[PDB]
Amino acid sequence: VKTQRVVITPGEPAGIGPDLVVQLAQREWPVELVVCADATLLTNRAAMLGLPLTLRPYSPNSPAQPQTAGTLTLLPVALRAPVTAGQLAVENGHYVVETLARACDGCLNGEFAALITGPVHKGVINDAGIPFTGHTEFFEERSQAKKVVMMLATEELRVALATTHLPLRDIADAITPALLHEVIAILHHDLRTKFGIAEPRILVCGLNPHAGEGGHMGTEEIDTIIPVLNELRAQGMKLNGPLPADTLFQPKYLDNADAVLAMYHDQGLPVLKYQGFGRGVNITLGLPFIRTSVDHGTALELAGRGKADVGSFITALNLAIKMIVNTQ
Template identity: 70%
Template sequence: GMITAPVHKGVINEAGIAFSGHTEFLAELTHTQQVVMMLATRGLRVALVTTHLPLKDVAAAITAERLERVTRILHAELQSKFGIAKPRILVCGLNPHAGEGGHLGREEIEIIEPTLERLRSEGMNLIGPLPADTLFTPKYLDHADAVLAMYHDQGLPVLKFKGFGAALNVTLGLPIIRTSVDHGTALDLAGTGKVDIGSLQVALETAYQMAASRRE
């Protein structure tokens, strides 16, 4: 497995090295077509269908093909790297109120629900699409192994509020275990002795637990 510390992409690119991040670098190095970003803290795992996209581009990026690929990877990795035999995954809708029956958007009706139904027919336990403001409540989260959010700022604010400083980033889909911290470089804190190691410690512990699950 591999645990990565934060890097400053701007500094690396200014040095003349094309680099968009550890995730993309490792995917290319391992010839992996599709990876999934998942952040986790105690009691909550949130994976993303889309990651670092402008909000105006998100709806067009939510295709049946992408949603199916991401869901399959999330389901398989929860089984193989986290030791969860039958993962229960909550899926967010894209629009407010999950589209309100098509009145606030049709992505749920035309893309998300048909894709989930097809995967359910294979035995996956997928609940949704649910409105995000309903899904992120104890009633649902207490019985979920992971949440699948449609975009970055739909899923991650709740996770960071719940576990900032004790959360980690996991790259799913790679042939190796890769975890990382959930924060940036904080270069202004370098050498001050004020750096919080909590997220790095969680990343180390989780990588160890994932490795143990794979051996069992």
């Protein structure tokens, strides 16, 4: 058994990502933590927080070593400008993108067994003149990925999104048998080859309230959702639904599921966040590599202060680690 390596991108320097990473470093880890970021950034922030940090260099041509408490391994990318916690900085936009580009490739190459990302600020990135829609779009394109799927998981509750950040008004047309087949395939595949579930049991939400109540609140379940499930169920895939989302989200139903397929953003996330502030993880399915992320944003306001909550990041790390195990 060879010790594995994982790359972490704290993301937005002015954000709380660097803080959270310093806290992560305060413990033992079965894998080596290769943090792609500015050393000075990590050093100062650590200092402000009052937490000891010791960076050791990324040595690719050497056996990997589990990261020991108070330490992290470094894969440097330099800040384009100095950093003051709490205040953004347009140019650091290229820095954030740099570390994201370096980490992705590392996983595309094979240097790292997984990528766990910290919160980034899109705005600042775009203002710096860089085309950026979010991590899930960045890693998707840079990997030449046919299509991915987003998931937010806690422990026993995993929710997948057929469509993501689309205005409410454009959802209906977006859900087509084409979208659904690609989607469920990647979901079912990954629940098996990543989460290690032999026979994944997916619950499926209907597009409409009450799953369209057949005759009344919509025909999308009759025209595209049901036919596709009828196909995949016949292929031995276990798919329960379309079910009204406000019936499906009960333990009587959940305690017998491996995951939930929500048709859109607000149909599945509200219950998840409610279910776990800390513990949630966003996992990108479909990517040519294991990638998880936190469930929160940059929280500039709390940066450098000394109060964080690495709960999500830690969870995203642990899960990234388990997936390694189930994918090795």
